[PDB]
């Protein structure tokens, strides 16, 4: 039965139409709340049968700063509470395909993603974790597959064996904000190249980090600026890293030059 005054913080409150994901650690649907009809991902979690007193407080208080976040480019987390002894995850569905999905096409078509279009999507990435960094939150996760994009082309940086691992993150360093920079590079050489930069296991591919052993992207089809761009964000070095804001003020620079 509805309960107005509990928002987004109660599943009385909505109506779940399909079970849309299966994950690790949970089930996913599609639902719409019933107080607005806004559509919404609905994530279930037997965080209790999985984690530990520990667990739980580190994952909790992580949900909750990410229920501060306010961006559109970034994946609204609506609400998070505990019902029927689950973690329940409210989120902005993202439910059009994704940047993994994207690069398929240009490589089913034979083509590679022209420059512009590199700059159309990855300036808004930039925006995404910008306001994350702003917001002092790392994201942990940046992926092809977790850089949602609507059926309008607008891209949502989704809900935080790693798709990309950085050096500090392959020897347990501690991740950092220098680390996410570090996938935004790989991230805007896989759009470039359509793979991975390093693309085999985890002292091949330290072998192959501490010496930029990845092809270098056509000179013909990207511009110096780009691959400058990339060639720095995936230093080894964090340091030698730029911070998220002067990727993101390259990124507008030339998107405004390329459109
Ligand atoms: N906000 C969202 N909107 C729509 N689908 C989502 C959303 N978040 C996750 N999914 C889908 O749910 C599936 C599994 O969720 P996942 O993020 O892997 O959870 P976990 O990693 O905790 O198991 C994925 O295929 C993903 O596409
Ligand atoms: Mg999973
Ligand atoms: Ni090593």
Redesign the pocket.
């Known amino acids: 039965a509805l309960r107005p005054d509990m928002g987004y913080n109660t599943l009385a409150n909505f109506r779940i139409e399909k079970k ?7 089930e ?1 649907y599609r639902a719409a709340c019933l107080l607005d009809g806004v559509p919404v ?1 609905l ?1 279930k979690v037997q965080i209790f049968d999985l984690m530990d007193a520990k667990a739980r407080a580190d994952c909790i208080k992580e949900i909750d700063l990410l229920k501060q976040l306010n961006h559109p480019n970034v ?1 609204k987390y609506y609400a998070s509470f505990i019902e029927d002894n689950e973690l329940n995850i409210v ?5 059009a395909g994704d940047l993994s999905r994207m690069i398929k096409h240009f490589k089913k078509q034979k083509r590679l993603i022209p420059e512009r279009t590199v700059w159309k999507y990855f300036v808004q990435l930039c925006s995404a974790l910008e306001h994350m960094h702003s917001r002092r939150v790392m994201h942990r996760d940046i992926k092809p597959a977790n850089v949602f994009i609507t059926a309008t082309g607008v891209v949502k940086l ?2 935080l064996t790693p798709y990309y691992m950085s050096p500090e993150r392959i020897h347990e360093n501690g991740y950092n904000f220098k680390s996410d920079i570090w996938s935004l590079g790989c991230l805007l050489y896989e759009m470039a190249a359509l793979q991975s930069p390093f693309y085999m296991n985890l002292y091949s591919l330290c072998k192959k980090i501490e010496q930029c052993d990845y092809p270098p992207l056509p000179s013909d089809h990207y511009s110096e600026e780009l691959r400058q761009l990339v060639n720095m964000c995936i230093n080894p070095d964090p340091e030698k890293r730029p911070d998220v804001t002067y990727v993101y003020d390259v990124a507008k620079r030339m998107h405004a030059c390329t459109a």
Not at 20 to 26: H, K, T, V
Not at 91 to 95: N, P, R, S, Y
């Open positions: 849309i994901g299966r994950g690790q650690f949970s996913v991902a994530k994946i989120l902005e569905l993202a439910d989704g809900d």
